[PDB]
Every structure is written in C-alpha cells, then in structure tokens.
Design a protein around this ligand. Structure first.
Ligand SMILES: CC(=N)N1CCC(Oc2ccc3c4ccccc4n(Cc4ccc5ccc(C(=N)N)cc5c4)c3c2)CC1
Ligand SMILES: [Ca+2]
Ligand SMILES: [Ca+2]
Ligand SMILES: [K+]
Length: 223
C-alpha cells in the first residue's frame, strides 16, 4: 500500500497473510475454514497467518494454519489476469475472535464512487521498494468503468474494476496481491494488478468479487 496509513493491530480482522517461508500475498477469511485470494498468488506449501499485525514479530494473537487444498478459478488466464481468484481451505478451522473475523460475500456489485478499504503488507513506495512490517490501510473509491478502460485499453474485462486515484499517490502495490477490497462491509475486490504503483492515470485493478459469489458458495459446499 502506497500513501496509506498504519491500520493498527487487528483493525482488519479478516486480513490474512499467505506465507511460504515468507509473506508473499494477502488474502481474506470468508469463514472458519476458507480464504479467498488471487489465482496469481497460487503456490504449493501455503501456510495461512491470521490475526497478524507485524509479520516479523509474534505478538501472540496469531494463528498459523496450513492449507489443505487450493482451488484456482477454472477460467483463470495467467496472461490477462481475467478471473484472478483462488480459494484456500484450512487444515483446521480458525478460531474467530475480535482479531480474527470473517468478511461477508457481497449480495450485489458496488457502484462507482463507493468508498473502499484496501489493506496489505505490500511495497509502500511509488517508485522504490520499501516493505512494511505492519499492515497498511487505504481508503479508495471505486472508479467508473470508463476511467478504468481508458487507462488500460483492451485489458479490462467485466471481471475487473478500478479503484484508486487518477491523480496517483495512493494505491495498492506488489506484496498486496490477493488482499481484500471491502466496500460497505462486503468483500468487493481482490488486489490483482496494475501499472507500477500510485502512478498518475494508472489506478489499481481488482478482481470483481460480486461476479464470483455462486462459484465461491458452490465450490466451498463441495470441498
Ligand atoms: C497481456 C495482458 N493482457 N496483461 C494484463 C494485465 C497483467 O498485468 C500483470 C500481470 C502479471 C504480473 C506479475 C506477475 C508476477 C510478478 C509481478 C507481476 N505484475 C506486476 C504487479 C503485480 C501486482 C500488482 C498489484 C497492484 C498494483 C497496483 N498499482 N495497485 C500493481 C501490481 C503490479 C504483473 C502485472 C498482465 C498483462
Ligand atoms: Ca504491532
Ligand atoms: Ca505478528
Ligand atoms: K504481487
């Protein structure tokens, strides 16, 4: 997150860190046994870390649970990032508390201009590299589809939306991938891609979750 603020210890309780010996992507807990992240974050040997603030210090609220199963969306296209979503099932159920909570699936898509909260442990530099230890937060509005498509000609699909600032300075970045985009208390997006980070006229692109609700519900019920 570029141009964000320090959220504060367990302020985004559904935020998950995917670890494979190091943090490599964010995720969102949708229930005691399932996490939603991006298909581009797919990897073997995933450990899910819940209730994390500072990823390099154990402050005692953490729950480290191995993944038993990974399911990348059937139509995921690594070339275009269309359908950038994966489900991750936990070996054992997480213990929900004030620090570890699940986020609800959206019942409908959100409108352009709706304010959202994006979070993660990604790079905080527009151009440079500086990874934080504590979770960063950022408020950003959903952009109009026209603005999104104008910004990335021939690359935006109906499964994507843009959020951020056209004037740049604030965005998600590498390290935030797979992370939640929460608008009006529902998971509306997943940090997917972009052109650099916080650049003028290059907002963040997010997987449009509301398109995936029956897929998520059905997949979960059968696994
Ligand atoms: C050909 C085509 N249709 N494309 C559509 C868009 C897609 O963009 C991509 C595709 C793949 C990768 C990729 C893979 C490994 C490591 C870093 C990679 N990056 C850079 C990358 C990755 C994640 C981001 C999250 C947020 C932001 C952001 N500004 N908020 C930028 C990111 C940049 C990519 C950007 C690939 C090109
Ligand atoms: Ca801390
Ligand atoms: Ca910690
Ligand atoms: K990334």
């Amino acid at each position: 997150i570029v141009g964000g603020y320090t959220c504060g210890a367990n302020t985004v309780p559904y935020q998950v860190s995917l670890n494979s010996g190091y943090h490599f992507c964010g995720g969102s807990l949708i229930n005691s046994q399932w996490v939603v992240s991006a298909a581009h974050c797919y990897k073997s040997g995933i450990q899910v870390r819940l209730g994390e603030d500072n990823i390099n210090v154990v402050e005692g609220n953490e729950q480290f649970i191995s993944a038993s199963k990974s399911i990348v969306h059937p139509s995921y296209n690594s070339n275009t990032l269309n359908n950038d979503i994966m489900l991750i099932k936990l070996k054992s159920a997480a213990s929900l508390n004030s620090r570890v909570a699940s986020i609800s699936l959206p019942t409908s898509c959100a409108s352009a201009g709706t304010q959202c909260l994006i979070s993660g442990w990604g790079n905080t530099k527009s151009s440079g590299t500086s990874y934080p230890d504590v979770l960063k937060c950022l408020k950003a509005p959903i952009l109009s589809d026209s603005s999104c498509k104008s910004a990335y000609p021939g690359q935006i699909t109906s499964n994507m939306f843009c959020a951020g600032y056209l004037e740049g300075g604030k965005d998600s970045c590498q390290g935030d991938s797979g992370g939640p985009v929460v608008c009006s208390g529902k998971l509306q997006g997943i940090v997917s891609w972009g052109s650099g980070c916080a650049q003028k006229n290059k907002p963040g692109v997010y997987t449009k979750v509301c398109n995936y609700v029956s897929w998520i519900k059905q997949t979960i019920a059968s696994n």
